[PDB]
Structures are given as C-alpha cells and as structure tokens.
Design a binder for this molecule. Structure first.
Ligand SMILES: COc1ccc(-n2c([C@H](Cc3cc(F)cc(F)c3)NC(=O)CN3CCN(S(=O)(=O)c4ccc(N)cc4)CC3=O)nc3ccccc3c2=O)cc1
Ligand SMILES: COc1ccc(-n2c([C@H](Cc3cc(F)cc(F)c3)NC(=O)CN3CCN(S(=O)(=O)c4ccc(N)cc4)CC3=O)nc3ccccc3c2=O)cc1
Ligand SMILES: COc1ccc(-n2c([C@H](Cc3cc(F)cc(F)c3)NC(=O)CN3CCN(S(=O)(=O)c4ccc(N)cc4)CC3=O)nc3ccccc3c2=O)cc1
Ligand SMILES: COc1ccc(-n2c([C@H](Cc3cc(F)cc(F)c3)NC(=O)CN3CCN(S(=O)(=O)c4ccc(N)cc4)CC3=O)nc3ccccc3c2=O)cc1
Ligand SMILES: COc1ccc(-n2c([C@H](Cc3cc(F)cc(F)c3)NC(=O)CN3CCN(S(=O)(=O)c4ccc(N)cc4)CC3=O)nc3ccccc3c2=O)cc1
Ligand SMILES: COc1ccc(-n2c([C@H](Cc3cc(F)cc(F)c3)NC(=O)CN3CCN(S(=O)(=O)c4ccc(N)cc4)CC3=O)nc3ccccc3c2=O)cc1
Lengths: 210, 212, 210, 208, 214, 212
C-alpha cells in the first residue's frame, strides 16, 4: 500500500501477510456474501493497483466470478478512456484505463500518480471498478430473489427480517427500489394482520410481531 | 482511525486485527450487551468511514442493522434540528450536517478535517454515540427474557440466578434509577433463599454468602 | 492506555485488540481463579479509568461478580471522598472518587491527572480499587476452605500441596494470618514423616514425602 | 527484505516469522495451485535473493518441483550471462547469473546492487526467474487439460466455468476463452449460448 | 520491561499480551520440563522485578512449586543482604537495594528502573532473574520423575530413543557439569547388544556410538 | 538479535515470542527434516550467540541430537582456537579477540558479543556460531534420515512424481558427489526406466512429463 511514515512523507509498503491471509480467509469463509465487499475495501486501504491485483490473484477458485470481474474492469477502463483520452521528458503522464488496472503501468508510475499533488488516485479508481464487479458477482452468487423470501409459518419475525434484508442486500437496485412494503406482504398472516394494523419503524414492527 | 505518529495526528487504515476482532465479536457474541463496549473499544479513533466499514463487515443480523440505520436517521435529523447549516467559504471547513456525520455525504478528508481541526468537531465520536444508541435498542430487542421472568430455579445456586438476573437486567434499557435491584432479586429468589434473604434488613456480597 | 512515544512524551493510545481479546479469554478460560488478578493488572498496564471500564464492560457473564465489584468500587470511592474532599479557570481540579472510577471525569481530565507532574495516578488508584473487588470475588468464587484441603489417602504429597496453596491463595487475610495446617491436613503416612523433621523447607517436606 | 525506515533510507530487515510461516502454510495448504505464485510474489515483496533462497529452502516436500525449479533457474542465469557478460577497488561489480540466484553473491553485494542508484534489482530479477519456474511447476502439477474440462450433464454452468477458468489459469493470445467454453458446454447450454452473438455475465445468466 | 526507543534512550514498556500469553502457555503445555527455564529467561528479556512478579503471578496451578520458588528467593535475598548491607538516604540520590528490593517486594517500579538504567547499572532485573532461575532449577529436578540411574535402554528400544531419554533425564537433574560429565553411565545402562558394541570402541563421539548401535 | 533502529544505529533487541514460538513449533512439527536448517537460520536472523543458545535451549526432546550438536560445536571451536590463538592481559578499554568458547556464548557476556558484532569491521560471532550450529544440524539431519538414496526405488504403482519427491527429499537429507539423474533413472520402475532410457541423458521436467 501507500501509507504515511511517522515523519510525514507518503511511502510504499508491502502488503502485510496479515492482510493477505485476512483476504484469502474472507473469500474462503464468506465466498461472495455481500460483506466481502466492505471487507475487501478495508483490507485494500492504501492499495496501489498492483496491490489490488495481488489481492485478486491470491483468490483461487471462484474463477468464473474472477473472469466476470475482469470483464467488468474492461468495461470501466474503456469508459475511462472515452472520458479521458491521453510525452514530456521527466514529467508524469496521464494514465489510460489499463494503467489504472495496473496492466500497463509500473509500480513507480502508480506511486507517482497517487502521491503527486494533486493526486491521481489510481488505487481508489481501480478499487471503484473492482467493487463494481464485486457487486455484480454478489448479485450473481445470490441464491434467492427477495420475492421468494416469505416468513415461514413458524418463523420468528426477526429471523424472517434477517433473511429479508440479507437477501435484499445481495440484490442491485436504486435505494429507491430497495426502500418495507414487500416486507409486510411476505410476512405470514399472523404478523401481516398485526403489521397492517399500523400506519411504522422496523423496531415497532418487530416489537409488534414478537 | 485517527491516531498520533513524532506528535502529529494522522489517518491510519483499520488494522486487519481490528476488522477480524469485530467480526468475531459479532459472530461469537451476537448482540449480548458486552458487544457495545467491545465495539466502542475497537472503534477507538474511528472516522465515520471506519464506523461504516465496521458495520458493513457485519453480515447477518441484517434486521438489527436496518434497525440501526433507522436509529441513525432519527439522531441525524435531530442533529440537523439542533445545528442548521449557502455556498461555503472557499478553502474553509464547513459545518457538518447529520448525514455528513454518518459518513454518507462527507468525504474522508472532510471527516479528518473536522476531527483534527482545533477545536475538534468529533464526528467520529458523535456518530459512535448514535451507533451505540442503536446498539442498545438492538441489545434490548435481542434480549430474550424480561427481568420479571428471571426466577431462581429450585435447584439453581444463588450465584447463577444472580448472574442471570444481572445479565438480563444489563440487556434492558432504563435510567439506572428505574433499574435500581435488591428487591425483585429477593422476590424472585426461590423459597429457601428468600427466607434467608428476608431475614436481613444488605450488600450483594452478604446476600450471596447467606445463600451459599 | 497512556504510554511513551519513541521520542519521549507520554501519550494516550487506544486499547489494542490483542489486549481486549487477552482479557476476555482470561475471564472466559480462568473465571475468577486468583491468577486473573495479576493478569488483569498486567493487561491494564498504563490504563486510564476509561480503559479499566472498557475492560470490565467487555466481561459478559459473571454479572453477579461484576455488581459485587461495583459495590466494592462505591465503598472505596466514598472512602476516597472522606480522605480527600474538594474552581480555578484553566487549572486542573482535584478528582472526586467518581472521577477516579471514570464515571464523572472525561478522558482528557483522566489524562491530565495522570500525565501532570507530579502525577495524580487515577488509573493506578482505580486499578487498586478494582483489584480489591477482584480479591473479594476470588474468595467468593473459591469453592473450598483451606481447612477442608486434606491430603487424600492415595494423593501424592505434591498434588495435595498444589491444592493446599492454590486454595490458600484464593482466601483473604494479612499474610501474617496466612503465615502448620499443611502438616496437620497431610495424611497419616506423610504426617509421621513430616512430624519427624524439626519445625523444614517445603522442598525438604516434599522430598521426604515422595 | 529491503524496506524503508520511517526516516527515509532503504535498509535490510530479517524475514518475519509471520512471512516465513505464511509461505510454508501456503505451500502446505495450496501445493502448486496457481494462486501460490501471486502469494509467493507478495510474501517476497522486498526480498533479497538470500530471502528468496530462504523461502524456497523452507519448503520441505515437493522436492521434485524444487529440483525442476533449480533447473529453470540454471536456464535463466545462463541466459542472463549470455546477455550481460561481466573489479575496480571500492566499486560495485556487475552481477553474474549466479550472483542473482544468491549462490555466489554475499548479502552485502545483494543489498549494494538493490539499493544503488540506479538499482540493479537482483531481488526482482531472481524473483522473475523463480516465478518462471513456479509457472512450469503449476502446469506440471495441473491434473487436467482445458480440452478435458467438459460441463457435466447435471453440472451448473457456473461450476463448469469455475473449473474451466481454474484449469485454464494452470496452463494470453493463445488462451484467448469464449469458444472452447461454449464447445465444451453441455447440449442444453450450448444451444442457449450459440443463440447469442456475449459477456460471461450474459452467458452465465442465460444458462442459470 | 526496559527497552530502547528508536531514538536511543532506555524506557519502561508494559509486558506485551503476546509475552504474557506465551508464558502461560509454556507453563500450561510444558509444566516444569527443563526447556521452561530458557523460555522463561527469553520471555523475561528486559524484565523489571515487577515484570518477573507479574509473570510468576500469572502462573496458576503448580502452587507447591511456586511456594518452593518463594523459599529459594528468600534464601538468595538473605544471602544478598549478607554480601551487601545497606542511615537515612542522601536526598535526591539513589539508594542501595536490599534483597527484598530486588524481588520487587519493597521497591517501587521507579526505583527498579532507576537501578537498572543508572550508569553503572544495578541490574536488579537480572539479579532477581538469576534467583528465580535458581528456584526453577530446583523445581525442574523436583518435578523430574526418574533418576538418571533408572534410565536403562529397553531391550527393544533403539539406541537413539534411549539416549534421548538419557539426556532429557540428565538435563532435569542438578549438579556441576563436572558431576554430569555422560558417556560412562550411558554405556553402562545400554542394553547388552549395544553395550558389547559400544565397549568395543575405545573410550568415542556420541555420533559414533549412535551409528555403531543403529 | 542485533537489528537497525528506524534512525540508523545498530541495537540489541530481545527475541520475540513470535520467533521463540516459531522455532519450537518447527522442531515439534518437523523434527530434523532438512527444512529445519533454513528455518533455524531465518529465525536466527540477527542473532547473538546468546540468542542462538536461547533458541537451542528451548528445544526439549531430541536431547541426543542436541548433545551431538554440542560435540560438533566443540570440534569447530577447538578448530577456531587453532586458526586464531588469542593475544597478555588485554588492553584496558579495548575489545579483545574472541576464543572459540566466546563465540558459542559460553565465556562471553552479551556486551562482548554485541561489541564484536557491531564493531567496525565486525567480528560476526553470531554468524560464526550459526555456521557451527548449522554444521551440527546437518550431521543430525543425516543421522535422523531413515533411508539411503540407494533404497529409494520407485514403487510398481508409484507415480513418477511421488518417487522423485521421495528421491530428492531423501537426497537432501544426505554437490559433486550429489550430482543425480542417473540413480534416479536406475531406481525408476521398469515401465518408466524404459521411457526414460529412450531419451538422451534430458531435463527433469521432460523425464516427469514422459512418465506421467
Ligand atoms: C481485465 O482487467 C485486468 C486484467 C489483468 C489484470 N492484471 C492481473 C490480473 C488480476 C485480476 C485477477 C482476477 F482474479 C480478477 C481480476 F479482475 C483481475 N491477473 C491475471 O490476469 C492473471 N491471470 C492470468 C490469465 N488468466 S486465464 O484464466 O489464464 C485467462 C486467459 C485468457 C482469457 N481470455 C481469460 C482468462 C487468469 C488470471 O487471473 N494480474 C496482474 C499481475 C501482475 C501485473 C499486472 C497484472 C494485471 O494487470 C488486471 C486487470
Ligand atoms: C442510516 O444511516 C446510514 C446510511 C448509510 C450509511 N452508509 C453505509 C452503511 C453503513 C451501515 C451498515 C449497517 F449495517 C448499519 C448501519 F447503520 C450503517 N451501509 C450501507 O449502506 C450498505 N448497505 C447497502 C444497502 N442495504 S440494503 O439492505 O440493500 C437496504 C436498501 C434500502 C433500504 N431502504 C434498506 C436497506 C444494506 C447495507 O448495509 N455504508 C457506507 C459505505 C461507504 C460510504 C458511505 C456509507 C454510508 O453512508 C451510513 C449510515
Ligand atoms: C460502581 O462504580 C462504577 C460504576 C459505573 C462505572 N462505569 C461503567 C461501568 C464499568 C464497570 C463494569 C463492571 F462490570 C463492573 C464495574 F465495577 C464497573 N459499567 C456500566 O455502568 C455498564 N453497565 C450498565 C449498568 N449495569 S446494570 O446491570 O444495568 C445495573 C442496573 C441497576 C443497578 N442498580 C446496577 C447495575 C451493568 C453494567 O455493567 N462504565 C462506564 C462507561 C463509560 C463511561 C463511564 C463508565 C462508568 O463510570 C464505573 C464504576
Ligand atoms: C539452481 O539455482 C540455485 C541453486 C542454489 C541456490 N541456493 C540455495 C538453494 C535454494 C533453492 C531451493 C529450492 F527448493 C529450489 C531452488 F530453485 C533454489 N537451496 C539449496 O541449494 C539447498 N539444497 C542443496 C542441494 N540439493 S540436493 O538435494 O543436495 C542435490 C544435489 C545434487 C543434485 N544433482 C541434485 C540435488 C537440495 C537443496 O535444496 N540455497 C542457498 C542457501 C544459502 C546460500 C546460497 C544458496 C543458494 O545459492 C539457489 C539457486
Ligand atoms: C519470596 O519472595 C517474594 C515474595 C513475594 C513477591 N511478590 C509477589 C509474589 C511473586 C511471586 C509469585 C510466585 F508464584 C512465586 C514467587 F517466587 C514470587 N506473589 C505473591 O505474593 C502473590 N501470592 C500471594 C500470597 N500467596 S499465598 O498462597 O496466599 C501464601 C500464604 C501464606 C504463606 N505463608 C505463603 C503464601 C500466593 C501468591 O502467589 N507478588 C508481588 C506483586 C506486586 C508487588 C510485589 C510483589 C512481590 O514482592 C516476590 C518475591
Ligand atoms: C558445546 O558448546 C556449547 C556448550 C554450552 C553452551 N551453552 C548453552 C547450551 C546451548 C545449547 C543447547 C543445545 F540443545 C545444544 C547445544 F549445542 C547448545 N545449553 C546448555 O548448556 C543447557 N543444557 C544443560 C546441560 N545439559 S545436560 O544434559 O545436563 C549435560 C550435562 C553434562 C554432560 N556431560 C552432558 C549433558 C543439557 C543442556 O542442553 N546454554 C547457555 C545458556 C546460557 C549461557 C551460556 C550457555 C552456553 O554456553 C553453548 C555451546
């Protein structure tokens, strides 16, 4: 990553083993559950594109997902190249899409762009792209539609809701589309009665159905 | 988080140690009360971004986490009432709205600016306050039993009963005036103990010795 | 905690996850075995009262013990307030009992008191109180009286002694009061052997009975 | 490794136990699965040739692979010696192939070359060679040809693809994908896939 | 412990949790096997007497051993007090430590640091450590199950195993390494088949004896 | 060990618990498999002779091996004393030449050891002693090696790769004399030996493909 020495300067560090291991475990244990994204994002704090490639490369298995991911990166790099078409000796060049994915850039270039003032945050840009791709995967790997999350007849409301919102987190839509109407619909009769009786916070709905 | 290098205050990444610690806490302890202090400790120094990171890494408990978002909305709206916010002065640092504190509408730089500025606007600590509010409501929610239903089993050692009593009591939300203890504790004691305890006019230490 | 930067200044750090986890494990694994006290004391090296509260709060279960602990803290804070009753703008105020327990003080105050020269070691004072309470608990949680630690007829002396001293460690009295019963409670075969020596090191007694 | 002190200077550190253990575990758990290469590369960030030797030496087992590896290093060192044939008192000498593998160089030389301006990145060069050898091994240890990765008749497309690309990784103009993937798909899917002109996302939706 | 800041000065740190845990595990896993001593010594690198007390206090169980240990410390502190007797101290100045100051009983942490970091150092940490290690040796011998005399090579026991037992057992026992000075009782206690073979060589390296009996 | 402070100076550190534990585990898990040597060498990066003694002392069990090791150290210290005999009473203040036993950390203090190592030019007593220990560790590894390379014959149902793995593992335990693809072919089973003999004495890669 790039991080700040107790002096003041911004310097390149290696990825820790702690971070490497953390990432592999995440992927091993949690597949492409949604909470992988924030965990990836956190574990890639400071990351150069090189570090992001390292991280993705250490993922074995899920190679369909990872090819899908490469496709999503191609799309976003091509779009970057549309919006910013691209040389002076000594000076620092503008990065193409493929420079951001760390394909055509060297580490030094990547550091140059990131630590320059103002920064070209190629790490953060590539990360944005990877996270796009990771969302598409998470939805892909999502087993069940939110429509098929119905409260079991002997299912405590809380459990149902847990499933509801877990499932909902996996899917991709405007948070307008994601914004407690299907929650009530899919509730079981006993609860739906109780919930329909109110005009309500989730806290209220969960108390009411407890 | 924000922490101290030399002498200057600087942004660090969240450690993997901290991330893992938080996930484990939530995996192992659900929303047992001791999650709150553990969250608070593990979020020492945290920017709102770090707090979001932490909450995002929680998979499962998504009902709780939506409940949490609601509690944050309530407190942000109230913040916006108490501190209304033009085009800001160029260069200068703007007043944060509620949603800036939850790290929704602020950038990391803004968040750092507010926290490290002198005097500090401790957006990290404010958001943390809100999250902890929400976490308490959840802990009460996830609490299975009312303190009224904590009755000493007929073959239950007093100490165990008390452990349950106070564990259960910790889960519930009220002024410690309302929680103020050694009245329902005695009531709910089993006969053998209730006799012994009623005999005294007493510390918990004394009650536990007496019933041992 | 408060600890020293490689420069020289005394500065506040967060509690490490390592320390948090260490403390929880201690309590999970060892309950209120006596060796919890020194382990708590070590893990609270440098601690502000805030850190001490954090640590105690992370203990789930043993809530009877922890209420008992709060009572012991009340006693000692009230006594502090007896011995030291009692504001100037800018200046640093004298801490009441409840300021030491971190109830009524802010972190800044706590740091102020501790890092001031001369120090008001509120961390160390509160720690003293907590350790008082922890001793009362350890005695409480102690199953057996030292009087009831009798060497089994087929029990190796060393085991007996191990039990003896473990049990003895749990109980609360001046080490004058703890400073005879080891020999008394020994089984006949050993008691003969031990009585044969002139009121002897433990090493000697354990060799003699081996 | 060679890494940067909070001051600013470049200095030699020992390999951490964390790194050593990490590497051994990788090799124990993942054998010569492809993701070992990037994991080796990451864990050898900063490495002197000495550190690279250390790392390879700590691998017990897979001694066939490791001899194969030595052969690949010989080839690349000999080639280095062809392309750069090879002292002034005080001054720093040009490294032969065997100096890069850390066989004939001392640690000091290795540091000298790496930290000199401009750098002679013997660490990175040797690493390049090791990674060459590691690829040959990964292909060796690969059980199945991409030709023999056929979608089972009751195999979900995603699983098939996972196998396809895992297998493909073990073996990029030549690797260039959405031609043998379709060929080897089972009938039901091949129909559906042939119907499109397509991203993998699209193909996987279509076959789901 | 006392350790050196990246500047240059010597400063007190807390004991790490890593160190605490390490010590407890050692004692849990390895009891009073001999390799506990060097492990204690290593884990107590830099230690103040306070840190040494902390470490010993975190040991639960083995309380017989730990009382034995206290006795050994009393003996050595009393002897210290004989060899270095100690008025009201000069104001400001640093006092001579009694035995009980070295065990961290009567000294404060500040005193302990003062003694250790002063030039020349009074290495109270290292002295107390010396005492603890004395006591730990007596314990290790105590907890040692078998005498070296009773380590006889089994009739179907490979020599190497026998030797492993021999020297493990020998390590547990306390005498001058003159008294421990090896390849005499090792041969005696060897089983017949080996004793023949070993006696055939002229009083030989251990390597040679182990090859010969393989 | 001796290592470099982020300033620039060379300073003594304690051995980490991480390093101690690492070493013990290595020895527990891997006995005297050959890869213990490089692992020891790595874990003893920076080591004073004191640190090397610490490390060896923490090894319980394998006490035969460890006595064998002491013998190997005696041999090499005596030889050191032959090649470098020691000067009267030493110059006051000045740093003395180390005898063999000073290098094994038997007769030297830590300060002396640091003095020798950090002096310019360095007397690398750590590295010298390490050399000796590694000599002894090799003799042990060969000792603890169960099988001769001659007795590594490819099983009739043994995949070549496995055979080779055994071959070279075994060979590592025991480089002109070690120089290889001659006994490897000899000891191959008939089916493979045919195939391998067909190629003109070939890389190992080629031999392993051919026999796969
Ligand atoms: C498409 O965007 C890309 C493509 C490549 C990289 N890239 C990479 C990426 C990082 C990566 C990993 C992922 F899991 C998912 C991602 F999205 C990104 N790794 C690789 O490409 C390595 N790698 C080899 C090729 N194949 S394959 O199966 O044989 C194959 C062959 C042909 C076709 N058509 C399809 C697949 C698998 C594979 O992994 N590694 C770098 C390492 C060192 C320096 C540079 C790079 C760099 O640039 C980065 C982004
Ligand atoms: C309610 O206040 C908020 C709202 C959003 C955030 N927020 C967040 C928060 C952090 C968070 C996590 C919690 F578990 C609980 C909390 F209270 C806070 N997480 C997310 O938004 C991620 N996320 C996706 C959306 N849903 S959902 O189920 O599809 C869904 C969709 C619509 C409706 N109406 C209900 C549910 C689940 C989910 O998590 N992550 C950020 C990351 C990067 C920058 C910014 C942010 C930021 O702003 C923070 C506080
Ligand atoms: C008794 O002295 C005290 C009392 C409270 C605190 N204190 C604390 C303490 C620290 C603590 C934890 C212990 F396990 C044991 C201890 F002795 C000390 N914790 C709490 O107050 C948290 N907490 C909630 C209340 N109860 S209860 O069961 O509902 C309950 C209900 C009715 C009655 N009458 C009594 C108790 C349990 C509980 O835990 N946490 C702080 C955090 C942030 C800033 C400040 C504080 C601060 O001041 C510290 C010392
Ligand atoms: C081939 O290129 C080389 C050759 C040697 C080294 N090298 C090394 C290498 C590192 C290494 C490890 C690998 F797994 C794979 C690699 F490719 C590279 N390790 C060793 O040499 C150790 N080692 C000895 C030789 N054999 S063997 O079985 O006896 C043998 C003998 C004859 C024949 N024909 C076949 C096999 C096994 C063995 O392991 N260790 C160093 C350590 C200290 C300083 C220097 C060195 C250095 O130079 C490095 C690269
Ligand atoms: C004998 O020399 C000593 C005596 C006491 C200490 N000492 C200590 C020592 C350190 C220690 C631990 C060991 F495992 C072994 C050692 F050798 C040394 N620990 C204790 O005192 C704790 N402790 C309490 C007393 N008993 S007991 O069973 O009730 C008991 C009762 C009656 C009789 N006659 C004998 C024992 C058990 C016990 O454990 N802890 C300090 C902590 C804070 C500041 C100071 C001290 C300090 O000075 C250090 C050395
Ligand atoms: C021969 O070279 C030596 C001899 C001794 C040391 N040495 C040591 C060495 C380090 C060491 C460990 C090894 F596993 C193997 C090695 F080769 C080297 N350790 C010991 O001496 C510890 N130790 C105790 C004695 N015995 S025994 O079985 O009772 C015994 C008694 C008599 C006879 N004849 C045979 C065996 C076993 C034992 O273990 N520890 C130091 C620690 C503190 C300061 C100094 C020293 C120092 O000098 C170092 C090198």
């Amino acid at each position: 990553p790039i991080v700040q020495n107790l002096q003041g300067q911004m310097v390149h560090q290696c990825i820790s083993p702690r971070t490497l291991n953390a990432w592999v475990k995440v992927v091993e244990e949690k597949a492409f559950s949604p909470e992988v994204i924030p965990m990836f994002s956190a574990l890639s704090c400071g990351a150069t594109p090189q570090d992001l490639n390292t991280m993705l490369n250490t993922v074995g298995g899920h190679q369909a997902a990872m090819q899908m991911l490469k496709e999503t990166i191609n799309e976003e790099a091509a779009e970057w190249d549309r919006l910013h078409p691209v040389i002076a000796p000594g000076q620092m060049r503008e990065p193409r899409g493929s420079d951001i994915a760390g394909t055509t850039s060297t580490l030094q270039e990547q550091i140059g762009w990131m630590t320059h003032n103002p920064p070209i945050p190629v790490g953060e840009i590539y990360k944005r792209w990877i996270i796009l791709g990771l969302n598409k995967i998470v939805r892909m790997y999502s087993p069940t539609s939110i429509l098929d999350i119905r409260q079991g007849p002997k299912e405590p409301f809380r459990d149902y809701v847990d499933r509801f919102y877990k499932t909902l987190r996996a899917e991709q839509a405007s948070q307008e589309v994601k914004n407690e109407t299907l929650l009530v619909q899919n509730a079981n009769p006993d609860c739906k009665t109780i919930l329909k009786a109110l005009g309500a916070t989730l806290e209220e709905m969960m108390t009411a159905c407890q």
